[PDB]
Ligand binder design. Structure first.
Ligand SMILES: Nc1ncnc2c1ncn2[C@@H]1O[C@H](COP(=O)(O)OP(=O)(O)OP(=O)(O)O)[C@@H](O)[C@H]1O
Ligand SMILES: [Mg+2]
Lengths: 544, 485, 154
DNA sequence: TACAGATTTTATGTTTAGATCTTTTATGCTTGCTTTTCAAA
DNA sequence: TTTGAAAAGCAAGCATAAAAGATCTAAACATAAAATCTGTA
């Protein structure tokens, strides 16, 4: 059986678009094709700019590393927030070999392995750039005699917050011994994600005094001045402009979710924006009308669900209190210049005022909610432009079919679910997951996991499993269990076990042991003793 | 191409890899292997240890006794000899395959008896009453690798040199598939059988399973040190194949040991030599000097050796040591050099038996310095006080300091205290350890008197006596200062 | 094939090939049971008798790689459109058919001894002596080898 | 036939990942005596 | 407004779970000389 293997390959026996028909199965297939294509132009237009921004991030970071590296002690560079993925490159400078040696905590079990891997990388690079040797520091001593050139070593310590600090300290003390050779210069790069003082108090003070002779600091992290986030979101604003507008609650959802992630908040922002765009082009049938040439494709269903807008509600209530298709197709030309205004106040903000430590997503949120003035009343340098930069948003009509909003709770179920809360809620309120359609037994008795969880939730530190099984029995009804267990005359073993006077307790024990080891696999319950199996401890509590 | 490491001292032998199953294309293609020029045994180093003798060495009156009592030169083993010889002769004459298990303590004549059996069997084969056979000797303690026996035996059979695995399938093919008429009988002595025991036990199974093959014509004579070896270390298959019959070589009685020593001392005891009084050289038939070694001395040595081990090596060595003590006294008395009655008396035999019994440990502890004795006294005091067999070194330091500072009124302590804590010197401050503390600690560790655990904190590190406590007590109260306090 | 006298358990397929392919033809190198499975397609029933297959487990490793050879041999003797049977002797629904050889009794030992000695013209044994030896060799796990050693020593 | 070169066999060294067992220390239940905060007079 | 009394707290005892590590061993990774194969000349 394939169920008892570890891994197996299946080739299924085969005998084109994942988008479905909307408007209760009345959407035409050409609208499905247009939705697929138009989603792909919006997605490609977003990710082209995302790719250029990402290559700009690596290019500028490589430029500043090369600047900080080349302008009798180590040249030390502390890279804060590194989350190391950079491919550092060095100069092709004559009469001196420049070798980059990268070391990880997996490659660092002791000092001897660090030195051996470093000298093997050094000899491999020096042979590839242009008899066997010992992989120790004497290769650094005789480097000019074997290759005729000076040596510039740059050590890239990847993930210093994972390396053993005694081993790293002793390796740095070992590398200090190469300072008596005139042909050697050494650079050290420490990739830090916690703090400088954290590594400062895990190293001895003599090593700290050694590193203090020539050291520089540089911030690497993606939230450095927000300018790499502010590009990407603006790229989304360069993609969706004139087509859809962002909701304020969706933008503050972006703000809260990016505030919860340290090292990688750019890709989380891209993932949330992509999933919102996927949800829009999968759910709304009006996304064909984003292209302005589909305005002849209106039907009765489109106008029937078009009239159910709060903006159209307020508009027709105002026009009734005062005194459809042509009204709809002419009002699709306005540009909604909030994105252009946001880009204008951004380029005004670092054009001459030299204010660069702002979040454009915060600015766009406060511009959406109408509280922009409270946002730029913080810097105390832009007091003279409270009317130059003032904007009032205009609530347009039927824009709620053309929008990206977070109110259905789909983003917080698909991207950031309350995982364990969902598990315990489906355990406890099971009628919610299971349909309410063994006809006489399914109405009366719960599934065994849900009933066992409801008895589990109302218990103490230690649950005695025999008394807990008795509490599980008293919830079950004996009569319809004995009736339903006799409802299959093909299996005679079940009938003769039902005829036994201890049938009900036995069947309840079958269900109880199966459900207990289901909870033990899921992690809800724990046997504290390896033997005996007479008591259990609860592990998890609902609503934490 | 750059290597991650180098092996610059690899020495590989010229051993082929193709086994004997692929030499010929068929079973019928194999010739009679007894006619092949390389099969069945068909030294260059003996001249390397030759020199030119330009002196004349002196062999004295006891020189012939000491040379003759060596192990290089079969009275008491005649039932074991008859059993091994009759089983092996029946196995040779019927063209059978047979295991003979022989076990015993060291020096009871196992290897000697099996070698005498195979010499009489080869002499019997030379008279054309049993078919000719090849004798192979494999000693498990003379192998570097246990699998080298596979290398050895096949090299004795074919004359080829293969690696051990290919030799193993070569031996399997030879013993099972080749018919009897194309083969020769092989008698293998496996000596030190326990040395050929591995975790897989494949060598044991193979060597005893080839004796269960119909075509093999293999006689394996296995020599063990215990009789319960196949039950203790080997599986039930190998124990079943070895068999129920097992020949035990008991330790020699003192009659048998006396017969062995008298057999080596026939022609020399109660004999006359011509002895030069100018140099000392003696010739078996200038003075006519009679040589005796007394039978009471031999019987005392034989009884002692028979009760302790029953070992012929020890009986011969005790007699040779007694003769060497007598010959040393003889050369001291007559002033002879290394160019009417002389007797190996019973006193030399008692000296030879007592020189391995005299307990130098107490003498060594008696002839130590005062600091080492003070250390041992302090350790014994701590074992008396807190009743523990392991004492921390800081406790020993503190109780040495207490022993100095309490019995100060002893005149020896007033003489020694400045030496112990300042090395007899002003401008040397008072020391936390005594002078030569680490020296006497390492010295007692070198002798095996002490055991020290491996800790880096010198105060909480434990020290235990490896020697018995009573001999340390008698060595300590032999000392006049330490027994006074 | 006696499994203990092989250097490794991984080469036994090769030795099966070395038991079956003629020396005049080409000698392919068999790495695993896939190559032998390819070799046995154009054929004539192939019978192997593996003695001490129990030594086809590996003393190192764990559960998984210890059975690595016997399971691949069992799959090769169970797949369709080959003629490869597998008799395995070891010491004490694709599962192999199990036969348990039993330890002999005294009367079975007596009948084996009389049948083996029936070729001899004169029996040098009194039959009561053979019965006494057989009944002392008929313990909880009594083998015929012990009876042979006892009689030969007699 | 043979031979230069490629591949295999046998043999060993290097480094990492994990198992097992031992010793010493945290921990968790039991039992007896002391405080103390909230359900009734 | 008191009262008291069951819930909470503290410490000694002691069996036991567990952390730390000493010792080792398998498995991946690595190299290498001699033998064997192999595709042509
Ligand atoms: N019966 C004997 N007669 C004469 N000399 C004997 C006799 N038995 C032993 N020896 C002497 O003792 C020596 C050692 O005996 P041998 O090598 O046979 O011992 P062993 O029992 O095989 O011991 P080990 O177990 O140490 O190998 C012999 O070489 C010989 O000098
Ligand atoms: Mg011997």
């Amino acid at each position: 059986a394939d169920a008892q293997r570890s891994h197996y390959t299946v080739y299924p026996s085969l005998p084109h678009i994942p988008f479905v028909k909307l408007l209760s199965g009345k959407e035409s297939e050409v609208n499905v094709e247009k939705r697929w294509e138009l989603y792909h132009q919006l997605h490609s237009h977003f990710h082209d700019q995302v790719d250029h921004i990402i290559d700009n991030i690596e290019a500028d970071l490589k430029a500043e590393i090369s600047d900080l590296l080349y302008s009798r002690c180590f040249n030390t560079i502390f890279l804060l927030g590194s989350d190391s993925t950079t491919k550092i490159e060095l100069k092709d400078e004559s009469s001196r070999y420049n070798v980059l040696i990268e070391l990880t905590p997996k490659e660092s079990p002791n000092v001897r392995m660090m030195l051996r891997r470093s000298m093997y990388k050094l000899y491999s690079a020096a042979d590839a750039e242009e008899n066997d040797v010992s992989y120790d520091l004497s290769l650094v001593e005789n480097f000019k005699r074997l290759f005729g050139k000076d040596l510039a070593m740059v050590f890239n310590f990847k993930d210093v917050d994972s390396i053993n600090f005694n081993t790293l300290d002793n390796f740095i003390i070992l590398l200090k011994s190469a300072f008596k050779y005139d042909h050697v210069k050494i650079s050290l790069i420490f990739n830090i994600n916690t703090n400088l003082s954290n590594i400062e108090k895990n190293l001895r003070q003599s090593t700290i005094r050694l590193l203090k002779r020539n050291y520089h600091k540089l911030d690497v992290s993606s939230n450095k001045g927000f300018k790499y986030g502010n590009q990407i979101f603006q790229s989304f604003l360069d993609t969706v402009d004139g087509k859809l507008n962002l909701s304020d609650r969706f933008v503050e959802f972006i703000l809260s979710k990016m505030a919860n992630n340290t090292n990688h908040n750019l890709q989380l922002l891209t993932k949330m924006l992509d999933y919102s765009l996927m949800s829009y082009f999968f759910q709304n049938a009006f996304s064909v009308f984003i292209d302005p040439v589909n305005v002849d494709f209106l039907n009765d269903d489109y106008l029937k669900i078009l009239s159910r807008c709060p903006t159209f509600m307020f508009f027709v209530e105002g026009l009734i209190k005062q005194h459809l298709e042509e009204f709809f197709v002419e009002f699709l030309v306005r540009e909604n210049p909030i994105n252009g205004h946001a880009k204008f106040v951004a380029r005004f903000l670092e054009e001459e005022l030299n204010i660069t430590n702002f979040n454009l997503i915060e600015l766009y949120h406060n511009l959406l909610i109408g509280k922009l003035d409270s946002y730029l009343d913080r810097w105390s340098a832009c007091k003279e432009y409270k009317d130059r930069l003032h904007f009032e948003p205009i609530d347009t009509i039927f824009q709620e079919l053309f929008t990206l909003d977070n109110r259905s709770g789909l983003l917080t179920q698909s991207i950031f679910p309350s995982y364990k809360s969902n598990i315990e809620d489906n355990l406890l309120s099971w009628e919610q997951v299971l349909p309410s359609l063994s006809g006489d037994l399914d109405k009366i008795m719960a599934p065994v996991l849900g009933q066992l969880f409801k008895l589990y939730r109302e218990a103490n530190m230690t649950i005695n499993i025999y008394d807990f099984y008795i509490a599980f029995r008293e919830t079950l009804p004996k009569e319809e269990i004995l009736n339903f267990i006799r409802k299959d005359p093909s299996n005679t073993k079940l009938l003769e076990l039902a005829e036994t006077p201890d049938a009900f307790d036995k069947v309840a024990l079958i269900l109880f042991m199966q459900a207990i080891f289901a909870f033990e696999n899921m992690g809800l319950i724990k046997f504290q003793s390896t033997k005996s199996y007479d008591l259990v401890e609860k592990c998890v509590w609902r609503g934490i | 191409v750059i290597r991650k490491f180098t092996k610059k001292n690899v020495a590989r032998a010229k051993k082929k890899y193709t086994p004997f199953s692929k030499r010929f294309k068929s079973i019928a293609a194999i010739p009679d292997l007894t006619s092949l020029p390389e099969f069945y045994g068909n030294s260059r180093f003996e001249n390397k240890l030759k020199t030119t003798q330009k002196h004349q060495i002196v062999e004295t009156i006891f020189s012939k006794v000491k040379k003759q009592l060596n192990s290089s030169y079969l009275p008491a083993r005649e039932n074991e000899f008859a059993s091994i010889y009759l089983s092996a002769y029946s196995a040779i004459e019927s063209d059978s395959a047979t295991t003979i298990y022989v076990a015993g303590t060291p020096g009871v004549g196992k290897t000697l008896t099996v070698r005498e059996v195979v010499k009489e069997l080869l002499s019997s084969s030379a008279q054309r009453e049993i078919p000719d056979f090849l004798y192979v000797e494999i000693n498990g303690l003379k192998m570097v690798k246990p699998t080298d026996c596979y290398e050895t035996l096949w090299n004795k059979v074919s004359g080829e040199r293969l690696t051990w695995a290919a030799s193993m399938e070569s031996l399997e093919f030879y013993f099972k598939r080749v018919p009897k008429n194309k083969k020769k009988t092989i008698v293998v002595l496996l000596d030190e059988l326990d040395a050929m025991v591995t975790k897989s036990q494949d060598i044991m199974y193979n060597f005893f399973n080839w004796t269960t093959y119909e075509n093999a014509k293999l006689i394996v004579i296995a020599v063990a040190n215990t009789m319960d070896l196949p039950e203790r270390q080997l599986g039930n298959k190998i124990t079943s194949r070895i068999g129920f019959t097992r020949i035990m070589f008991t330790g020699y009685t003192h009659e048998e040991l006396k017969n062995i020593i008298d057999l080596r001392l026939k022609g020399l005891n109660d004999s006359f030599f011509y002895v030069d009084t100018k140099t000392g050289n003696a010739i078996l038939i200038v003075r006519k000097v009679r040589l005796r070694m007394s039978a009471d001395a031999i019987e005392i040595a034989s009884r002692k050796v028979a009760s302790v081990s029953g070992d012929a090596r020890r009986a011969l060595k005790v007699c040779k040591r007694a003769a060497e003590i007598a010959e040393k006294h003889y050369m001291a008395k007559h002033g002879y050099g290394y160019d009417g009655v002389q007797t190996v008396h019973i006193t030399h035999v008692m000296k030879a038996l007592n020189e391995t019994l005299n307990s130098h440990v107490i003498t060594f502890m008696t002839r130590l310095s005062f600091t080492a004795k003070l250390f041992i006294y302090a350790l014994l005091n701590l074992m008396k006080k807190n009743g523990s067999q392991e004492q921390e070194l800081g406790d020993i330091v503190d109780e040495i300091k207490l022993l100095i500072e309490v019995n100060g009124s002893n005149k020896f302590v007033m003489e020694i205290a400045k030496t112990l804590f300042q090395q007899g010197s002003d401008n040397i401050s008072e020391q936390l350890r005594i002078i030569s503390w680490d020296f006497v600690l390492n010295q007692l560790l070198d002798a095996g008197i002490l055991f020290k655990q491996t800790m880096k904190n010198d105060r909480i590190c434990c020290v235990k006596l490896n020697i018995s406590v009573e001999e340390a007590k008698r060595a300590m109260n032999e000392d006049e200062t330490l027994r006074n306090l | 094939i006696n499994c203990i006298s092989l250097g490794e358990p991984s080469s036994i397929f090769q030795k099966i090939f070395d038991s079956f392919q003629d020396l005049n033809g080409p000698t392919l190198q068999i790495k695993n049971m896939q190559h032998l499975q390819k070799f046995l397609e154009p054929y004539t029933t192939f019978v192997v008798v593996l003695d001490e297959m129990d030594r086809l487990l590996h003393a190192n490793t764990s559960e998984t790689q210890s059975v690595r050879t016997i399971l691949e041999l069992f799959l090769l003797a169970k797949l369709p459109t080959v003629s490869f049977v597998l008799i395995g002797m070891a010491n004490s629904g694709l599962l192999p058919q199990t036969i348990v050889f039993q330890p002999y009794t005294a009367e079975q030992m007596y009948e084996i001894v009389i049948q083996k000695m029936s070729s001899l013209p004169t029996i040098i044994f009194q039959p009561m002596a053979i019965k006494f030896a057989a009944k002392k060799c008929a313990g909880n796990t009594g083998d015929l080898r012990k009876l042979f050693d006892v009689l030969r020593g007699s």
